[PDB]
Structures are given as structure tokens and as C-alpha cells.
RNA sequence: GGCUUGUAAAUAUAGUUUAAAAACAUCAGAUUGUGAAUCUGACAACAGAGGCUUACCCCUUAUUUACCGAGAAAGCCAUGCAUGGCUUUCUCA
């Protein structure tokens, strides 16, 4: 009964395989074989993508260990799942918009704004042009702020992608500011990985960005005495934002901790260094003192706009610190009592 | 969990679904009943009919996940004919198998005569991905069971090339199979295995020790006497009284460590970052200018012990107490420590300085490289005082053997502070003067096997050894 | 001061005209909010006290303006100031190549009729009314103020009709000032920039924030009270004549 | 040069428009004199030659201008330039107290309809027509030139309606230039001073001599050929856009 | 309200500056008449009262202006308003063919140095002290008013240097307003016409009377108090910025 | 035509002046590139041909300009056109509160001397030689074309001195036109926008690209040949006098 | 003013929060008729590297919190009068 059943259906499977193989087969590069391999992972149910690209397959091949390959496959699957979910959500939203638009069409009430509009609805273009004008002004009179992309050696592909994304976000935040910085992309090799990724990400706007990009190091562009290199490892704690100095931020996302690299480069160049006064103003609790580029630039913009430390540090992630020191006026009382002590 | 072992005649499975889907999460049956199976080895004969009607519902095709689960079940219950048929199934169904599908296939395939097919499958999984330690163990066990000593040795060398730590069961089964056949080349391989075990420091179990005794006694060339022995206070040997290893390291190995640290301090980028090359060379010149020093004293490690005691006070106390022993003293100072503070008293600092020379380094400098280099230059006779475990420094070491020798040195040449009360007196911790590792002397051998029942923690070592004599 | 002066404010039921009415009435003057019948100006007139009255009239129609001026004379007896704040705004591109859409001519015609033709109609009728006033010690019989726009100078895209009307007002300012100089009537024009009136406050919050950021300083939409204060300053000064004053906060509208 | 161009000249049967048509045709271009049926433009078009065609149309009428543009397209197949020179003038004080006379609303409405509304109608219809042209090397599709007056800046007594219309043209010049920038159409405005055209030559020789004396230099009435030359220069130069050029001879019109 | 405000008035010992100081000090404000040592401004400062002080300084000299501003800060501690009324006038034709007379370069350079260079020097130096003031409600740190002339628009014969200086002031009005907008300082310009002050006494009496007769309305010379009133109105209004106001009485100067 | 005319072009060794010289010489006219000794104008003069000569002179020095004009008269014996295209640009904010930086007075002085004072010096000196010319059939003796900037009307941040100089030029345009009207010398001003000349080398390339992209149409930097063509058009037209022409492509400069 | 080792334990969301996948966000192109409140694209990695199979462990780095001074007494235990270890008391810095 059942034994004959499964043996016979297995003979049928053999026939299916032979008829499938009857078709002509051509030479295949190794990656193609791996497709079937990957497909097997999909059959079991592991976190692997439905479909993959040849370049992605190569990237997987350069992975050194099994774990790395598993992590890459999980990344790809998560990306595909997010894309599918967003596509389905967009379809649902489109259906909702269609039904709402027809519902509106039913009434045909008209009599809107008395047909009295002072401006056409071209607000996005106007905002873009205004930001462009502000950036053009800043390029001549703005305060320099340097991102030195000299860390490509210490970063991996994932870190490079994260750094480029953070740089894009930081540039956007600076651009949309009331008093934008003048951003210098220093030590940016033309054919380097960071430059290639930035060009691939900014598309044609790369040549139209109102920021200065140059291969020359920051030391070659500004006096050595006017440069302050912001690093979390500096033994000097930032006190007040200074408008006569040039602040250098290390475009370096070291998810794999490499403390002192930024400080090491600063010391090698013989430049002043400073660190944000996080411990002085926050109950740190649990977290990493090194912040992202976007948070750093937003903090610097808030400080440059005459904001106090309490307002500026609001951009630090809340999950890290429990909260600001309740007053810090106790430190002021210590200061005044000690001042009385001298007198 | 009403799970019968009888054939699943069609009608029954109908009800098997009703009131069961919601009973177990993740679609229950087709996913969980197979896991529930594999009990008593009678579940195989019924899971066959399970899959039979599953395929019946299907269009004459079986889910690959179900197929691999059936592979797991049958191989766990050792049905060699089923392994043969499922190997044919894989051949006729898919051009390529799946990870852990290869594993189950080989685990079944060991008992058959088609060992070379297992070798081809291992190479196959190799072409695309790195196979697993369990795969290696399984295939070597099959190969040795197939009397193919040369190929077994070749695949063991392949394992070593891939740099995966082998499973002790491998080598145990290697010895067990070797039991029957005696050969000089085989004995040389076994000696190499034992030397590798000594290098890697891993300790074997009771079954491995039984295999060791069986083989070693079975050697016909020399009659040997085997007996389980005790440590006996570090006494040479509970039975037959052979001197038991050592805490101290031999001069030649000490010198090779010196050479390794030299060639590492040269061309060390991370070493440069943690310890600036200028400071490294300055310290090297300092030690060269000064004569060899009997002892090396830890930086601030002693001082920050007993927090209430002033750092300068405690440092002066310890250094004076050691100086009363009329040995040569070296202390590792710090640049910051130079500046006057409440903790640092300049009078005591200068008194200790004139009492014995010192070296100062910045915060980023790491004490461990300086201490290690000073000790190595001084030689075997010297000792070092500290409390840090040196885990950070022993990391990023080049070779496992080098790491083992570094650990041996760390245990040795060390006099840990043990006086529970500093003001009361100064005491130095005793030296056990031995370790737990196979020593394999001439005409006799000794191994630190662990009895299987006890769950030894990471820092614990076996109590009972095994001894071979004559 | 302005105590006793009678002012006729066109489009005084909302925005700049209403703010001017509030400021002038609060200072002791008298106001005649001339506005459309269904503009809700009666409520504003009632709220402003007995010194403010409402005149339902369409500036584009001669008869209604004449009736409103007659009512103002009957209620107060004289007219001393005129403030042309009535107007409408229409935004439409001259021609859209992509959509093949041409600017409607009726939109242009009605924008001219309300913004430009109505202003001149009110100017001529109120000048005729003021001609009967006895000249003061300075020889002045009245003052006329018009609401132009910065568009007249830098109108943006889609502001063809609005810019045309406001530029017409600006151009006709000086000729009318010379026309009425022998009579002794001063004519002035105010070119407001961006102001927080219903013409703009109805826009989304993001648009309002962007417009506020646009102004160099103060970086906010102009307050109608500021326009009212400028109008009062023009009234008090006996020498501001035939000039356009840009009350825009140094803004230059973008393309 | 301007050889091969097609120009639509409104009010081209007399005065400045006729001079522009003569100059352009002499250069080699093709002209469409758009004018009123009872204007004698047929004789002028016959005189110019085959390259010139007369179109009886009223700028104030959408249908008439559409028919004229259709005729121009049929005759020549494209439109490259458009010169708005059609307009009328009325002299009337805003309010004369001595005579108790008030400016009529009909005169103001007619002047606005002809000078301003007609110009915008022509501008929009011609922009629609020129949107079909293939862009040249510089991306330009056509040029629109409008005629204004110095009255837009320095108006005289009794020039209220004329000054209003011309100021409206001046104000709308730039917003349209921005509107048609993506299309690739340049918009320019010329503000002539005093010119010896039928609008002025009809006046008695005494006032003509006085006006000729008024101009600082040259002390003579403007020659229409000079206006035509300026129009040709504007056409040739590919960078003049959204600007008002005062072709007045440095005269600032006194009150 | 201008109670408590501190104003630095250049050329405040005579004419428009003195009138502005008189008006402001009369309403509780504090004035620092910045003028030449020989201008006799100490008498005016003594007359005005304890709330007014005299600073002998030459606007063309950086050191003198710095000393005057330091004195003002020491006496009052703040500088809320600046009024640039210091200037001189020179009459000379650019070239006289009949006499073979050429405009001397020294006179032109002196006129620019006093009228234009001095004004910018005062602006730049006073912006430093006005930057110390904490922003008030609305963010305003101070106000700057400059005295241009209608010559900047319609200058007469023999008025090249004066017109150049005033046109420079007019041109730089807006750039400076944009420069100081982030700081929160409002910059405005007033273009007076014909005002009765010592500056006119150089012109022959008959010419001055004729010019007074030529103002459309009021047909008289402007009163300095009227300029002071306009200045106060500008100060009070927090929205007038980067704009030129022609306080001329509708006059348009003929050649 | 312009054949036979003699032109003195200040700053003719580069940029707009060089383009004007090239265009005029190509048409047969004679040119005298008046420029600084180190500007390398001798190479350009040699390149242009025999009809063009080089005059090493500093427009701010009376003696240098006199020597240059004497040389021009010696070589050609007549001066018919004078193109003032010599100037410099400086970028510096009036005051920087954040940086505590104040605009330098010497920068302002130098910019005024080179741009404004030099232009007037050249005008006054050249009018002397142009007065010797026998008046043409139309009474004209010569033409003076000054170069200004749109900054005279709309100057962006950090342009106070440049804007002041160009505004002074714009202001003195008309008064000088009236001064020289009796002797038949026409004075005109051109206000270019953005042009591809070394003056823009100071600005960053990205800023220049953005500004060019912001021109409504054509969306690109102005071509100096366009400025030369406009200059030739001004020369040819006998009725363009005392006016500022904005050759800017309809661009309005935001802060 | 008291700022520097080490041992132990607990955690680690690279734009931010919440849960154990969502919202607000980010960049490029859409001259948008006023819901652009949108359309087409880009990036979506729960500290870092090793394994374990189906859900967990080894190691590294970072953050935070504890850990250490001594005298004796009281209740005892083990080793050769001395040493080691726990619980409460006050004492000295
Ligand atoms: N709002 C701005 O930012 C702004 C800027 C510059 C210029 N302006 C001009 O300022 C003036 C003030 O208007 P607002 O801004 O207060 O807008 P608004 O709509 O609030 O005021 C316009 C008033 O005019 C009245 N009105 C309209 N058509 C009328 C008619 N035919 N007859 C009589 N009354 C009529 C309306 O009822 C209303 O009371 C308008 O002309 C406007 O175009 C406004
Ligand atoms: N004459 C001057 O000195 C002067 C000065 C400044 C401005 N302008 C303007 O210059 C333009 C030219 O006028 P001109 O001096 O040649 O006088 P003109 O009377 O010869 O020109 C007017 C022309 O417009 C035509 N026209 C009038 N209404 C028309 C309509 N509805 N439809 C079609 N054609 C119509 C007339 O038939 C005539 O051909 C006018 O717009 C005038 O306002 C003239
Ligand atoms: N707390 C902090 N203080 C100062 N700079 C900081 C900071 N956190 C982040 N940054 C800045 O943000 C950059 C990215 S963080 C990367 C840090 C890395 N360890 C390094 O060697 O820099 C840092 O390079 C530094 O420029
Ligand atoms: Mg350590
Ligand atoms: Zn033994």
C-alpha cells in the first residue's frame, strides 16, 4: 500500500527530473551553482532571500566564514521583506486614495477658496531654491566645518554604507538650517570607495552640492592654530562653541571599536582636540559615547545658533542617558563658594 | 499527543487535522509530528505512511523539508537500507543537496560500503561552503571504519589545514579503530596526535583514556604498565614516582618567546598604537643600560590595592619590604604618577626612586608588553608581581602553542600578594610548581584526563591522571 | 492726532482694512467699512462701536460706491481719509506648455476690475466728496492711500494679473497726486509684503513657516497692526505725497 | 540678423508698429500687421510687399486675435516675434473742482481694455502659438516686446488711465518673463518718450515745438525708426529679458 | 513709544539732524549730536537738555567716530538708533563747453568722502555697539536711518557729485539691510525733497522760492519737523526695512 | 554702422571691455584700451590689429587719464565713444556679530575710488575731447556708456561697497546726461547681471554654477559678446540717453 | 580639590522611539490648480567576530554599578602557637 505509493511517486520524481534535464544545458560559472545551494536554504526556511543578483552573489562569495555569509543572507532577506511590505502598503494607500477621490467626486460642491489664491502650489521648488541661495551665501561667508574621509582603510563595506548614509543626513540637516555651515569634504580620494559611493548615491546632484570637496588634507586649507578636531577620546572637554575655529569631524563609523584612531590622527598632525561634555551634562547610564555624524552636526548647529548645552544635547539619543543632570546649578554653587574661598 | 505507531490508513488522517491545527503553533502537523516521532525506533515505520499519504495529497511530489526530516529520523535510527534508498532519492530528485542534508546523508552512509561517495559528498559541500566539524567527525569515522587509514589521515590533515578545532571523539574513534592494526607509521601518527593535544591543552575523557590504555598496552614492541594516578601534593607521581611537569619554563622555550616578542614589537601596528615605538625603544634602551633585575613590580596595581591606604605609603611599604630581601627591584611608573597629588607624595616618591630605578609611561601605554619584555630579557630566574589576568595581551597572539607557553609563564615566575592584611605583614603567594597537561617523557607517559561525570568549570582542572610506565 | 477724522476704508471687513479701522477708531476717529454685502462686515462695525459704520457696496460698481459715500456723509457729515484696501488675488500661469493650458481671460478681467478699476472708481468718487471740505491751516482737504503689493515690482510666477493690477495702481499713484494737488488732497500708496491676513493664514502650516523664514527681518509675517500704524503715520505727515512705500521687511519675492 | 523671422505686430498699421514692420521687412523678416479693420492697414501691407500681411483683428477680442494668429500661421507657418504696439490715449483729469467734473469710469475702462487687457490677451495667445516652435541653439522659442510709456514712471496731469495701463504693463512684464522662462520665450518692454507719430503729430505745431524743446537731447520728437531699431536690437540680443527700457531721450515729464 | 531710546545723530547740530534730535529728546529719548567741532553743536546740546550730549567728530575719520560712540556708550550705555544726516552739497557742472570749465576731481572726491564714505563708516562702526544690545521682543537690536536725496533719482544740472553720493547710499541701503538682518538691525533710507534748512541758503533766494512754488502739494519748502516725524514713524514701525521713502511732496526735479 | 568711430574703452584688456573692443574693431572702428600697465593689455592690442592701441593708465589718476586721452587723440585725432568698463569687486560683510568682524574702511575707499570715482574722472576728462568734435548732422558729439551692476538695485550679502559704487554710478547717470545735453553728448548706463569674465574667478565654481542655473532664461552666465552687442546698439541708436539698461537675463538676486 | 589600575556582575537598537514589525525620519527626480496630506526612484544590518542546530553558547570592545583599609569580641570549621573562611558589633583614616 503506502510503501508502493511512496516508491512509485519517487519513480515519478525520477521521471520528472529526467524530463527536466532533457533540455540542453550550457556551461555555468560557479556563482550559478550557488543559486541552487541558496535555493535549498529557502526550501528549509532559513532567513534567505527569494531572489538574488549576480553582484550580490559575488559579494557573498567574498565572505570569509560561514557566519558572515549567514549574516549577509539575513540582511538580504530583511531588505526584500521590507521592500515587499512597503510595496503592499503603497498599493493599499493607492486604493484608499482612489476611493476617497471618487467619494469627493460624488459631492461636486465646488466653491473653493472663492478662487482666491495668492500663490501657486510650487512650495517645494521655492524651498529648494531658498536653500540653494543660503548655501551659496554660506560658501562665501559660512563657518568652515570639515569632514575628513581618511578612514576608508579602517572601515568595511557595511561601515562605508552607514557612513555615507550619515553623511547624506548631516548634509541635509546643515542645508535646511537657518545659518548653514560651509562643509569641506577633505581627504576625499576621487576614485576612493567613499567618493564612488557618494557619487552613486547623490546621482547628478553631486556636482551641484554647495560644499567644497578636495583631496587635500584640512591642514593644507586652514591655519594649524584655527583647527579643533572633535574626538570623544580627547582629554580636553568642549566648553563653548567658538565661531573663529574650524571644527573637524571624523567621518568614521567604527561599529567595530577602534578607540583612539581619530585622536591618533589628530596627534600625528599635531592639532588641538576636544570632546563633547556629555558626562558633565547627562546621566550616561548605558551606551556608547561616540555619536553619529548627523547628531554631531545637529549639536554643532544648535550651539552655533546660540543655543545652550541643554538644548544642543537634546539630539543625543534618549535611550543612552536617563536624563539631564537635574539642575547643574549645584556646580554653579560649588563655583561661587570656591570663588568666595579665594576672596 | 495521541501518536500511534500503526499505519495511517487514509480515513484516519482526516480527523488528525480537525481540532489539531490550533492545538500546536506553526501549522502543527507536517512540522511538529515528525519532531514528535523518532521515539523507540518504531516511529520510522509509521512516519513512512505519514509521508506516503502526504505525497498522495501532493501531486506525486514530497516537500524537501519533510524529506530531510525523514532523513534525520531514519539516520538517527540507523536504517542503512533507508539511507541507500534516500541517497538514490537525492540523486534522482535534486542535483544539489542542502546543508545538514549532506550531514544526515553521510551519517547514514557511514555504515554502507560507499565511503568514497561520502568523500565525494564532502568535497561537494566543500566547493561552495565550509563543511562543519560534525561533518568532518562523521566522515572520518566512516572512512576509518572502512579501513582506509591513508585517506583518513589525509582528511585529518585537511581538517587541520582548514583550522577547525577537532572533536575529541574523533581522535578517540581513531585510536579505537587503530586498536586492531599496528603499524610504525600509524604509531608516528598517534604520537603526532598526542603532541597536538599537548599543544592545544585540551584534556580527554574517561573513554579516551580507556582507548589510550588499550592501544598503548596493545603495542607489542614494548610491554607497558598503566595505572590511574593521583597528583599527590604535586608529588612526582602517585604510582612509579615520575617527576610531574613544572610551573617554570625551560630556557630554550623562554628564548623562543623572547624572539617572538622581539619580532612582534617590530612591525606591530597595534603595538605601536597602544605603545608608541619611541617609548618602546626608550624602554628597551633603559633595560639594556641597566643590569638584569631579579623582580619586576606592577604599575599602580599594588598601589590601588587597599584603597584606604595612601598609594605612596603602600608602595613605599612594599618596596622597602622587598629591599630588605636584598634583591634587585624594578618598578613600572607612569607619567601621570609623576605629578604631585593627594595620592602621590613627592617625598615617598623620590625615596622609592633613589631606592630603585623606575620608568614612566603615559596613559595609553600598556604595562603588559613592558613587563613581558623585561621578564624575558631578565631570564628564567626573575619573577613578576601583578594581578591583571593579561587577557588583553594574550589575545591577538600568533600561535596556539605560543599562547600556551605564555599562559605557562604567567602562572610561573609569579608571586601573588596573599597577605590578607598589608599593615600586619607582607606575604607572597606560594607556587604550585606544576600544571595540568600531558608530558610524555621517555619510557613513560602521563595524561591529565578528567573523569566524565564531574562538570568541570572553566578554571577547574582534573584531579585524577593516567600513567603509563615501562 | 487723528481725533475727529472720518475715514472710508474699502474692504474694511477683513485683514488690512479691518486692522486700519481698529487702529483709527481706537484713536478716536470715525470709520466707514465699505465692503461687500456678504463679507460679514456688519459684525465688525458693531464690534467697533458707534463711531464705525458699515457700507455694503461693490467698488467695481459706481452706484454702490456713491450710495456708500452718501451714507457716510449722512452719518458723519464729511470725509477726511480714504483707504483702498479692497482687492482679490488670482494665481495662474500665463501659459503651461506641458498641459497646453492658457491663462483665462476672464480671470485677468475680473482681477483688473476689482483691484485696479475699483480702486480708481473709489478714488475719483471720494475725491469728489472731499472737494467740499474746507481746507485746513495747511491747505489740505483729505488724504487717499492705496494698497499696492511688492508683486508690482517682483511678482512671482503665476501673478500676471495681480502684478498687472498692482503695477497699474503704482503707476497711477503719481498722476492722480498731481491731479488733486490744486485741490489739496495727498495721494500715497503702500506696497505691503507678506502679512498675516486671511489671504495667507489659510495656507498650510509648512507654507506659513517657509514664508516667515523668507522675510530677512523680522523673520515673520507682517502684522496688520503694523500696516495700520504706517497708514496713521502717512495720515499725520503732511508731506508724504505721490510715493510708494514698501512695507515688506526688506523681502524680495523669489522667481 | 533677422532674415527668415516671422513677427506679429499689433497696431502695425500706423506709428511705432508700422515703423517696426517696415524695418523688419526691409531686413528680410515677415510681418503680420494685426490691426483694426477700419485702420487703413491693408494699404500699408500691400505697400510693404509679399512678406507683409494685414490681419483685421481687435486685440480686446479673443476670437479676433485667434483668427489673426491662425492666418499668420497659415501664411508663414510659425511666429517668432510679437510686438505689442496697439494702444490708445485719453486725457482727462481725475476730478476738476472748478468745473465740478469727475473722470468717467467708461474712459478708464476703455483705456484699460485696449492698452492693458488687449496686450495680455495678445501675449497669452502668442505664447500659446510660439510654444510649438522648435528651440534654437540657445533654447529660445520666441520674443515678446511690449510698448509702455514713461507715463508709467512720470505721468502728467490727466494721464490717470493711460498711466495706470502702462504701469500695469510694466508690472506684468517681469512675472510673465518668469512664467515663460521654461518655455524659452523672452519678454521685454520699451517705454518710449515722445515720438512724432499720429498720436502726437496731430497736435498744433506750437505744442509740438515746445515738446521738442523739452527733450534734453536730441531736442526733437522721437523718430519711429529709432524705436524700430531698438526693437530689432532687443530681438537680436539673446540676453535682454524682463526689463523696461526707457527710449525717452532723457526727458522726465514735468507735472 | 521712544521713551528711553538712545539715538546717535550725525550732523545733529543743524537742519534735519537738529530737528530730529529736538523731536526725539522731546519725547524722553536720549540724543548724541555727532557733528564737527566748529559746527557749534555744543550750544544746541545745552539747549536740548541733560538728555542730549554733543560729540565733536568727523564722520570721514574712523578715530573720531569711534571716540564719539565710546562717549555715547559711557554716557548712556546703549545705542538703539542711528540717524545719518551729516552731509554737504556742491553745485558744479560736469563740463562747461562755453567756459571751457571742467569739474574738479577734488570737489567730487570730497563730496563722496563726506556724504557717502562717512555714512558707511558710521553705519559699520555703530553696528558694533548695536550688536551688544540684547534682542528685544521681536529680535530687534537697533535701527539705522540714512538721509539720501531725490537727486539719487532725478538730479539736476550741476549735481553730479551729490547725485552720485546719494545714489550710492540708495544702492547700499538694501545690501546693508540684508547684511544686518541676522543681527536684527533695521536699515532704512529717507529721500527728502526740498526742505527749509541752511543747505538751501547757498542757493539764491529767488531760486529757492521758485522751487517751493513747484512742489505739487504742499506748495512750500519741507519743514524739518516733518522729516523728524517721518524718522520717528520709521523707528516705531518694526517692519520698515531696506526701503527708500521719498519725503519729497510729489516733486520731480526738472533738468 | 560704426565704421570710423574712435572709442576709448577703460579696462579693455579683459572681460567686458575686451569683448566690446573686439566687437567694435571687428566692425572697423578704432579702439584705445585704457588699462593698468600690468594688465597685459599690450598683447590684446597687438592681437586686435593696427586700429587698436593700448593706453597704460589708472582711471583714479587724473594725470594718467589725461596722458591716455592725449595718446588717443595723437593716434586718431578724435574721440567718439567712451566705454567705462573698468572696475573691481570686493566681498565683505558690513559687520559679522558671530565672528566680531567689521568691514574694513580701506576696502570701501578702494572700491569707491576704482569704480565710482574713476568712472566720473574718465567721464569728465573725456567730455573735454568729445567737446572738440564737430557736431554730427543730428547734433551729437559723442556717447558715454558706463558699466553698472544689478547690485545697484538688488545687492546680495557682502556686497555693500560694490553696491554703493554701482548705485552711485546709476544715480549720477541722469544728472551727467543733463549736464552734457547742451553739447550733444549722450550718457547711458548698462547694468549687466552675471557674465563669464575673470571677475567671477573670486567666487567658488559651484556658487557660479548655481547662480547661472538661477537665471530665468537663458539659464547660463552672460556672454561678453552679448554686452558688446548691447553697447553697439546703444551707440547706433541716437535716442537712448540717460537710462540704465538691465542686461541681466531677468535674474533677481536673493539675499 | 580628590581625575587615572585590576576582579566581578548587568547591558549594547549607528537617524530617533515602540514592540519582540511599525510611527516619525533621510537622499535624488517630479513648474504640484491647492489633499504634493502625493507619484517614481535610493538606504533599510538590534555593539564586533567565531561556532550550535531549529533556539542558544566561546571570545573581543564599550557603558554603568559594585568589589577591596585595619583591631578585637562574639558562633564556629579546616591545615602545619601560626595561617585560611563566613555572620553581627563598635573603633581608627
Ligand atoms: N495679504 C497679503 O499678504 C497682501 C500682500 C500685499 C498686498 N495685499 C493686498 O492688500 C489688500 C488687503 O487685503 P487683505 O490682505 O486684507 O485680504 P482680505 O481678503 O482679508 O481683504 C480684502 C477685503 O476686500 C474686500 N473686497 C473684495 N472684493 C471687494 C469688492 N469688489 N468690493 C468691496 N470689497 C471687496 C473683501 O471682502 C475683504 O474685506 C488686498 O488688496 C491685497 O491684495 C495683501
Ligand atoms: N506716441 C508716443 O510718443 C508714445 C509714447 C509712449 C507710448 N506710446 C504707445 O505707443 C503705441 C503706439 O502708438 P503710436 O504712437 O504708434 O500711435 P498710433 O495711434 O499710430 O498707434 C496705435 C495703433 O493701434 C491700433 N489699435 C488701437 N486699438 C486697437 C485694437 N483694439 N485692436 C487692434 N489695433 C488697435 C491703431 O489702429 C493704431 O494702428 C501706443 O500703444 C502708445 O500708447 C506712444
Ligand atoms: N563624544 C564625542 N565628542 C567629540 N566628537 C565626537 C563624539 N562622538 C562622536 N564624535 C565625532 O563623530 C565622529 C564619528 S564617531 C567615530 C569615533 C571613532 N572612535 C574615532 O576614532 O573617531 C568622531 O570621529 C568624532 O569626530
Ligand atoms: Mg591591563
Ligand atoms: Zn607515573
Numbering used by the authors:
A (entry chain F): 61 to 403
B (entry chain E): 112 to 581
C (entry chain C), D (entry chain D), E (entry chain B), F (entry chain A): 7 to 261
Quote the original article.
The cryo-EM structure of mt-RNase P in complex with pre-tRNAHis-Ser shows PRORP bound to the acceptor- and T-arms of pre-tRNAHis through its catalytic and PPR domains, respectively. The 5′-cleavage site of pre-tRNAHis is positioned in the catalytic center of PRORP. For this, a stretch of conserved residues in PRORP (residues 497-504, in red on Fig. 3b), that includes the conserved aspartates D499 and D503 involved in coordinating one of the two catalytic Mg2+ ions used in this family of enzymes for RNA cleavage, interacts with the phosphodiester backbone of nucleotides G1 and U2 of tRNAHis. The density map is consistent with one Mg2+ ion coordinated by the scissile phosphate, D499 and D478. The second ion is not observed due to the D479A mutation, but could be modelled using the crystal structure of PRORP from A. thaliana. Indeed, the density map also reveals interactions between the phosphodiester backbone of the nucleotides of the 3′-cleavage site, C73 of tRNAHis together with G1 and A2 of tRNASer(AGY), and two long loops of PRORP that contains conserved residues (e.g. F417, P418, K419 and F532). Second, the PRORP PPR domain that interacts with the T-loop of pre-tRNA, further binds two helices of the TRMT10C NTD (residues 61-106) to form an interaction surface for the tRNA T-loop. Notably, helix α1 of TRMT10C (residues 61-82), which was not observed previously, interacts with the PPR domain of PRORP. We show that the first two helices of TRMT10C interact with the PPR domain of PRORP, clamping PRORP on the pre-tRNA.
